[PDB]
Amino acid sequence: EEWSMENLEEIAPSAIADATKIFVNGCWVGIHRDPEQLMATLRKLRRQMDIIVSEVSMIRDIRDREIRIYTDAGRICRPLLIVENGSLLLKKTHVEMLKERDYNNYSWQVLVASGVVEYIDTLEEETVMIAMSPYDLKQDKDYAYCTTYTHCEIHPAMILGVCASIIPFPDHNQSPRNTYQSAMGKQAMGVYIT
Amino acid sequence: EIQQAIKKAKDDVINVIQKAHNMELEPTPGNTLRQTFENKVNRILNDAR
């Protein structure tokens, strides 16, 4: 409300058809007439942890002219690297900083607070483009599948669980066999605790 | 030979998508355009396999 937003109680009902509605936790609060610049400002505010924490999900429904902001509990998120202008925001400098958190102090929270990793939830995934690998970013534009990437997977093997990630080469097996091993990994025998 | 056959089948299904987008795919009687397109794609991929 301090940035540029017009509240619902202070507008005429005939001035809504051009603007973009804003929903905060499912409550319609008002409208805004520059949704792309506001969405970029909100992403910049979330990536610095200034006002908005990294937990908050923000969605820009482009074709329906909506902005939905969700802050409640129960939402499930995945960390993803940030891609802008066809390049990763993670550099070799951050890898050396992680080698010196293996020495001292550049923890994962500092990495998220630096603005290179965002928590994208399962509702924001409909509005973002996720690269499978950095190999997809370097393709020439003559045969490029996409040129506007917004995120990149850290590793695809993180889509598995706990009992399913003990399987050696699960991409060479049939899927019900992987399900059977995830069922039988809980029934194995070993040193359960020290 | 197997990889070349799979690549040729993928080029065939890309050409089928292109002719469907260019309004050149005549639907068969008894089913609509989506059903005809899905039948052609499934037939191409199953024949390739």
């Binding site: 509990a73 390049s87 993670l90 | -």
Partner: protein, 146 residues
């Protein structure tokens, strides 16, 4: 500026270093501990702050000489203090409850909860007086480990 770009084998090493950092900080059961800490602090404070106050009025309608202005009481709960998990024995001596002591003795790994109570005594025609009952024990809440 291209020296900062991560090469391919450096990308596999770098991404597994990033995953190692994530699992070094967060761990594997972070959602349980985070939800419990949120529950304890904010949920218990919001329950004891959003609960309606007790409103009272005496009704001595079965006896003669009934006063037209009966005395009234009000009770308010405002603050929550949570201690460490502590066990009181049969003689009443407190002791720190270890999780292994709770497992071996079939006890409940719980911590007592204390609440501040404000009791306002009001008489029609007199100034109401406030009484503070601090650290009032109301029950033990179980504590999730780690």
């Amino acid at each position: 500026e291209n020296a900062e770009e991560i090469s391919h084998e450096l990308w596999q090493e770098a991404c597994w270093i990033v995953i190692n950092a994530y699992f070094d900080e967060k761990g594997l059961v972070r959602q349980q501990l985070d939800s419990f800490d949120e529950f304890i602090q904010m949920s218990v404070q919001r329950i004891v702050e959003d609960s309606p106050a007790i409103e009272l009025q005496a009704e001595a309608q079965h006896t003669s000489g009934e006063v037209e202005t009966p005395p009234r009481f009000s009770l308010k709960f405002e603050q929550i203090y949570l201690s460490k998990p502590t066990h009181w024995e049969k003689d009443g001596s407190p002791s720190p409850m270890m999780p292994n002591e709770a497992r071996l003795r079939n006890l409940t790994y719980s911590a007592p909860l204390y609440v501040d109570i404000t009791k306002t005594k009001n008489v029609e025609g007199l100034d109401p007086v406030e009484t503070q009952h601090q650290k009032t024990f109301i029950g033990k809440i179980p504590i999730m480990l780690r």
